[PDB]
JSON list of C-alpha atoms in Angstrom, two decimals:
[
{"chain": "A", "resi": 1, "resn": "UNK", "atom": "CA", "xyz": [31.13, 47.83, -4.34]},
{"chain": "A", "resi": 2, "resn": "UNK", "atom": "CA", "xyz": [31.82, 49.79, -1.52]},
{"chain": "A", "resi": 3, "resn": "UNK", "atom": "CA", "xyz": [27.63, 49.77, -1.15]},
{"chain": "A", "resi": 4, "resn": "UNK", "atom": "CA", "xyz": [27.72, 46.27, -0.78]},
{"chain": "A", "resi": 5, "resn": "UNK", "atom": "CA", "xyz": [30.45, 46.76, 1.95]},
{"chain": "A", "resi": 6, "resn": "UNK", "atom": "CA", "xyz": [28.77, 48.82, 3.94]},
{"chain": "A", "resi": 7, "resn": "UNK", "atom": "CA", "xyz": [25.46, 46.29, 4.17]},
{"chain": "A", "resi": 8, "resn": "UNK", "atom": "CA", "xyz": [28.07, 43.35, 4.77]},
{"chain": "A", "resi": 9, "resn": "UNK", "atom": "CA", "xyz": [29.67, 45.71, 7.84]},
{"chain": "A", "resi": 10, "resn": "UNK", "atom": "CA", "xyz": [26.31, 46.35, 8.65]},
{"chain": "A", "resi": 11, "resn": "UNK", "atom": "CA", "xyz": [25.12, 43.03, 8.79]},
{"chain": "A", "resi": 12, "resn": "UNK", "atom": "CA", "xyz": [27.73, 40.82, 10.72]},
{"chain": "A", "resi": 13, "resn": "UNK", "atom": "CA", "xyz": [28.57, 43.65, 12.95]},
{"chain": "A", "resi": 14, "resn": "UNK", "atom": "CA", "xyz": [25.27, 45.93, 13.91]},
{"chain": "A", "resi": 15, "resn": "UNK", "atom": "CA", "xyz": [23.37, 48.54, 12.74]},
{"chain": "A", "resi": 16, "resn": "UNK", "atom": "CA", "xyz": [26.07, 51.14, 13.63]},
{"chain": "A", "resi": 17, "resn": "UNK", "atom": "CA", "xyz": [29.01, 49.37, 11.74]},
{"chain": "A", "resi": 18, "resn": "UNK", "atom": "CA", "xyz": [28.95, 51.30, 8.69]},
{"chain": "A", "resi": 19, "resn": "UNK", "atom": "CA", "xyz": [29.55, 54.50, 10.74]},
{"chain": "A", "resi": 20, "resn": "UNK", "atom": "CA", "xyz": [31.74, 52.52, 13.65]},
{"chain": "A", "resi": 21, "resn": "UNK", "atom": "CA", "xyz": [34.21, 51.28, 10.59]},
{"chain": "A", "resi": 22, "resn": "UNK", "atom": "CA", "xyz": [34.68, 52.90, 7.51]},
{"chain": "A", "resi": 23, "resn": "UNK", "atom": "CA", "xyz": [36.21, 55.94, 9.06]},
{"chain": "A", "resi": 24, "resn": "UNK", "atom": "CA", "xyz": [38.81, 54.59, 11.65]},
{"chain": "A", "resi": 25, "resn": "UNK", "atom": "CA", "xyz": [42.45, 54.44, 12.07]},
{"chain": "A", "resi": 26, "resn": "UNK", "atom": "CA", "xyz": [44.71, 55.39, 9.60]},
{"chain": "A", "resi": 27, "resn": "UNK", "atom": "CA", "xyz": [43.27, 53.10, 6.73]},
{"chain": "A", "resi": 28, "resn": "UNK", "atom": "CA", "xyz": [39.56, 52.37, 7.17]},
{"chain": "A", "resi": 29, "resn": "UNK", "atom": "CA", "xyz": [37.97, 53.86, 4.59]},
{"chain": "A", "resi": 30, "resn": "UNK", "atom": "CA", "xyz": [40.20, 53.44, 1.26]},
{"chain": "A", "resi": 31, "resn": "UNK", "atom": "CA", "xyz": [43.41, 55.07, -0.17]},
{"chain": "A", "resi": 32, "resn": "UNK", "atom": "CA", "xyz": [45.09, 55.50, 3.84]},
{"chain": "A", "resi": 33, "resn": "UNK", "atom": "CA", "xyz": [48.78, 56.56, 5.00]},
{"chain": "A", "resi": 34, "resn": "UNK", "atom": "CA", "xyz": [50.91, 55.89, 7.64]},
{"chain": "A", "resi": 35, "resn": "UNK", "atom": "CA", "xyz": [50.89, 53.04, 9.94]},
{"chain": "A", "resi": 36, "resn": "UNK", "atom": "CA", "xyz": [47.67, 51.12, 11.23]},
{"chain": "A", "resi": 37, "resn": "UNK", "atom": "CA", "xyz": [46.67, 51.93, 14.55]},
{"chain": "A", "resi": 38, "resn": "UNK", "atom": "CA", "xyz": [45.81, 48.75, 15.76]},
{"chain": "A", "resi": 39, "resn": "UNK", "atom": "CA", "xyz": [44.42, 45.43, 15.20]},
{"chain": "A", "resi": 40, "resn": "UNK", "atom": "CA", "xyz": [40.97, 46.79, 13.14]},
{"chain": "A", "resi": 41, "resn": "UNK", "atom": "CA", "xyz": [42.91, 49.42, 11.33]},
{"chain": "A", "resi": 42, "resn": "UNK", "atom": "CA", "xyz": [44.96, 46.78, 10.04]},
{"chain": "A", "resi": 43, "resn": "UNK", "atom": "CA", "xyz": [41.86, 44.30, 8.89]},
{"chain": "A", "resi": 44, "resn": "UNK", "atom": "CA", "xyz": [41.45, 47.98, 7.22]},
{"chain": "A", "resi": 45, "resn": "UNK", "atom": "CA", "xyz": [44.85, 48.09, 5.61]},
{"chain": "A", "resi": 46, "resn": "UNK", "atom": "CA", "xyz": [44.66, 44.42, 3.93]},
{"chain": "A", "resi": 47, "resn": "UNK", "atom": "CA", "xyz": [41.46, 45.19, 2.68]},
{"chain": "A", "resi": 48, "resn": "UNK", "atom": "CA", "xyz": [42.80, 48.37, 1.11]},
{"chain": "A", "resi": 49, "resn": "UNK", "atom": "CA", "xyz": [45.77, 46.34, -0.44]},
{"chain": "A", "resi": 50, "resn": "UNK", "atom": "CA", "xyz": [43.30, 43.27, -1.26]},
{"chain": "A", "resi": 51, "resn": "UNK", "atom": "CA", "xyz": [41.41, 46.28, -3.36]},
{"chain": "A", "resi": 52, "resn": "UNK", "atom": "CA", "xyz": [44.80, 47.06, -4.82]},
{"chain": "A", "resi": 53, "resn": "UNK", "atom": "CA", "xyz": [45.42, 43.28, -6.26]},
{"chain": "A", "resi": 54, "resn": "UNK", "atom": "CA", "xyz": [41.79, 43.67, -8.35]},
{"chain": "A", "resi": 55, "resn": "UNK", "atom": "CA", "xyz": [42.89, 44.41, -11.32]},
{"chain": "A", "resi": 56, "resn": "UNK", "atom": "CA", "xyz": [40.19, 42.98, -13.78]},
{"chain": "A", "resi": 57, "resn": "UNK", "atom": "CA", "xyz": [37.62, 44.91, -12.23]},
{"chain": "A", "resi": 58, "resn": "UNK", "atom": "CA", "xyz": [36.93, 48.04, -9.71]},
{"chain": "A", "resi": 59, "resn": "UNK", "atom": "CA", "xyz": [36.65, 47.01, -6.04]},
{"chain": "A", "resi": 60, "resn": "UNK", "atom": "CA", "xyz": [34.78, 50.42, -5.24]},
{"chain": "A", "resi": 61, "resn": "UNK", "atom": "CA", "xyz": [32.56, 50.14, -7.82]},
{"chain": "A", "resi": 62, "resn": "UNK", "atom": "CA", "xyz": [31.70, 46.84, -9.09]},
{"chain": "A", "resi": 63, "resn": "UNK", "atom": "CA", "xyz": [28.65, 45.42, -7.59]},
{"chain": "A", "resi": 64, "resn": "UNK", "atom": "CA", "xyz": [29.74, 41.55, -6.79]},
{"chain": "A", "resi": 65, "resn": "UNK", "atom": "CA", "xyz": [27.33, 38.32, -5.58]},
{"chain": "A", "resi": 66, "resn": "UNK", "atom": "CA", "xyz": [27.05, 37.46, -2.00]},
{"chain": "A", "resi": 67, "resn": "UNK", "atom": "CA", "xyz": [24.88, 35.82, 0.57]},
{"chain": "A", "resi": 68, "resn": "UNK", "atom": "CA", "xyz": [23.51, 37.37, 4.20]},
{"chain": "A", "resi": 69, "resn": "UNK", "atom": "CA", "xyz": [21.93, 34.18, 5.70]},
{"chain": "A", "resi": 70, "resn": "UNK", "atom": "CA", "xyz": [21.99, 33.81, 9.76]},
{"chain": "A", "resi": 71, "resn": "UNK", "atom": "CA", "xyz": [23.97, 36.98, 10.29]},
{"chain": "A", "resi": 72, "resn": "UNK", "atom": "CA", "xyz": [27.18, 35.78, 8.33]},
{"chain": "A", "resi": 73, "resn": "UNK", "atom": "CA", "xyz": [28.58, 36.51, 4.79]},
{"chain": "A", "resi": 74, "resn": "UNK", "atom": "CA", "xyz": [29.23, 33.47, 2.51]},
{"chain": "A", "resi": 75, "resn": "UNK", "atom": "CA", "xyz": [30.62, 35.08, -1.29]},
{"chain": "A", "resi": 76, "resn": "UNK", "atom": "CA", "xyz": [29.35, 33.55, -4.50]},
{"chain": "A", "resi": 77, "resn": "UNK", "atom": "CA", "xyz": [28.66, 34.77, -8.15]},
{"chain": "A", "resi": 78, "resn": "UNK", "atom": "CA", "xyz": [30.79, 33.20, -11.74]},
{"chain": "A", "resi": 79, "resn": "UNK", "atom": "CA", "xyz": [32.83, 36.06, -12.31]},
{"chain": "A", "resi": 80, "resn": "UNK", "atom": "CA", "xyz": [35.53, 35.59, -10.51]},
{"chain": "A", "resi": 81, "resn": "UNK", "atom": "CA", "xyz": [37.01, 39.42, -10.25]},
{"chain": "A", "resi": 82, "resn": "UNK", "atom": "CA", "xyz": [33.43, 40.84, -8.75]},
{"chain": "A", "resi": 83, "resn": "UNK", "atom": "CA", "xyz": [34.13, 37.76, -5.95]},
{"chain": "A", "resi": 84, "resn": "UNK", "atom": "CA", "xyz": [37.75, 39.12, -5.66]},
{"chain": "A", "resi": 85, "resn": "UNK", "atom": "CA", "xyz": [36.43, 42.23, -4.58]},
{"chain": "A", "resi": 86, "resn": "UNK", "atom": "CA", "xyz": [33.50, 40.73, -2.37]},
{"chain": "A", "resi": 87, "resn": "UNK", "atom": "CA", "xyz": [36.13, 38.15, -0.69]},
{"chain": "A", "resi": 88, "resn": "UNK", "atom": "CA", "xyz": [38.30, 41.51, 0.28]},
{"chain": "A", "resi": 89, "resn": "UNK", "atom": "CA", "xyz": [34.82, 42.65, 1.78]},
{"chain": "A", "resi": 90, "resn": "UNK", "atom": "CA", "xyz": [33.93, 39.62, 3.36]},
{"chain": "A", "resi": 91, "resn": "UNK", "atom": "CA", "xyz": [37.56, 38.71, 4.94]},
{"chain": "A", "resi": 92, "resn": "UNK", "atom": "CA", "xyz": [37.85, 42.77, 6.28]},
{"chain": "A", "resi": 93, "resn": "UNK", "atom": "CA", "xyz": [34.04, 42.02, 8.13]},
{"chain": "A", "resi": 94, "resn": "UNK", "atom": "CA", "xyz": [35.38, 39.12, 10.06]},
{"chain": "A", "resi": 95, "resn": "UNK", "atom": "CA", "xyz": [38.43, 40.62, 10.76]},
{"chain": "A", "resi": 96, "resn": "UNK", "atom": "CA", "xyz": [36.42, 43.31, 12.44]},
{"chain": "A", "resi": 97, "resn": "UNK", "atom": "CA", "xyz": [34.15, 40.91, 14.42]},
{"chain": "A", "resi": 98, "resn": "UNK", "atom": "CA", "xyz": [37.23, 38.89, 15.05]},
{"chain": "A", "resi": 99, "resn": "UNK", "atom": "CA", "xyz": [38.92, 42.26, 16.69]},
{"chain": "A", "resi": 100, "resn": "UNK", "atom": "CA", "xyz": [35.69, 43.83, 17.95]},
{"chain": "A", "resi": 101, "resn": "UNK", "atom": "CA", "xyz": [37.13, 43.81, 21.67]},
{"chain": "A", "resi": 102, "resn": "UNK", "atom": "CA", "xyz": [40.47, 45.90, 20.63]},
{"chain": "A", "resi": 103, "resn": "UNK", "atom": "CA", "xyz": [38.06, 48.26, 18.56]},
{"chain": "A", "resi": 104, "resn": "UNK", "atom": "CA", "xyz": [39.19, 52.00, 20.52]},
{"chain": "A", "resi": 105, "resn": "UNK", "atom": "CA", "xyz": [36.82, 54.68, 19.64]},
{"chain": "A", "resi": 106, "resn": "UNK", "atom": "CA", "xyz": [40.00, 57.08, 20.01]},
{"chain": "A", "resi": 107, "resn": "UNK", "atom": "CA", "xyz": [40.79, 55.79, 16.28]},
{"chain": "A", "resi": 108, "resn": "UNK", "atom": "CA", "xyz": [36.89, 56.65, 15.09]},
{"chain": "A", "resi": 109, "resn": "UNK", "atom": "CA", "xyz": [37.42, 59.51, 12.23]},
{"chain": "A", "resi": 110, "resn": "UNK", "atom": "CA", "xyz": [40.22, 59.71, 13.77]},
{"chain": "A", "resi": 111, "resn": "UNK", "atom": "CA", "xyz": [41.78, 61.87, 10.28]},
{"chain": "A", "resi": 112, "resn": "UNK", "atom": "CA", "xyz": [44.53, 61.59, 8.03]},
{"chain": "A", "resi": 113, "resn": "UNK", "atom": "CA", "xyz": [46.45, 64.69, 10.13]},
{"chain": "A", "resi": 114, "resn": "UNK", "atom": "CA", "xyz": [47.07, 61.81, 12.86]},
{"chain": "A", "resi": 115, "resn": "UNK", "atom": "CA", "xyz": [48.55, 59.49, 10.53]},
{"chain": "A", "resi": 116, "resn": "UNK", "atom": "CA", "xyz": [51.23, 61.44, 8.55]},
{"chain": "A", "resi": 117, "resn": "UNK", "atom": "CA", "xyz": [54.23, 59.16, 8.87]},
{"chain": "A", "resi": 118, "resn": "UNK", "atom": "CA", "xyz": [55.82, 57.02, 6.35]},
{"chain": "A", "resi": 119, "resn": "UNK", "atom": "CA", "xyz": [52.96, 54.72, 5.08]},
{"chain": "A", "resi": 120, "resn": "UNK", "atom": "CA", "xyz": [53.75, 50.79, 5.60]},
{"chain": "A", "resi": 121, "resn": "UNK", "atom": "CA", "xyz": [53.46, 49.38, 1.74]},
{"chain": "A", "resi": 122, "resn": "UNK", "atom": "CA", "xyz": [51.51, 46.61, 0.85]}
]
């Protein structure tokens, strides 16, 4: 669930993560349009797609099975659908910790008004 998200952004990337990514670029958060802003808007836009291939199951929803153990994020559970959705999760967090040092507060709630071109599809 997007719950579970937020503790998984909160746990591999700080205390402020939550706030620092869900609203940022054109597509963090979920349900964006127009072209990613940079390298964490576009962790941001395959983990909106990554939602979009969870089809058993809802990604925003659903609460899944995962493991916070020395500050990383190892999915789990025996339904596989809820760890579709936490593997979406898990792969966006990295790709934020893996980007951290391109992360431009310029793109923080930076609002769908500044990203009103043609969407890329998934």
């Amino acid at each position: 669930s997007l719950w579970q998200f937020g503790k998984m952004i909160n746990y591999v990337m700080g205390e402020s993560g939550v706030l620092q990514y869900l609203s940022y670029g054109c597509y963090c958060g979920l349900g964006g349009q127009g072209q990613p802003t940079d390298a964490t808007d576009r962790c941001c836009f395959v983990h909106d797609c990554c939602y979009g291939k969870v089809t058993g199951c809802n990604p925003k929803i659903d609460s899944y099975t995962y493991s916070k153990k020395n500050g990383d994020v190892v999915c789990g559970g025996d339904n596989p659908c809820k760890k579709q959705i936490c593997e979406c999760d898990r792969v966006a967090t990295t790709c934020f910790r893996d980007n951290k040092d391109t992360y431009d507060i310029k793109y923080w709630f930076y609002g769908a008004k500044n990203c009103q071109e043609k969407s890329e599809p998934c």
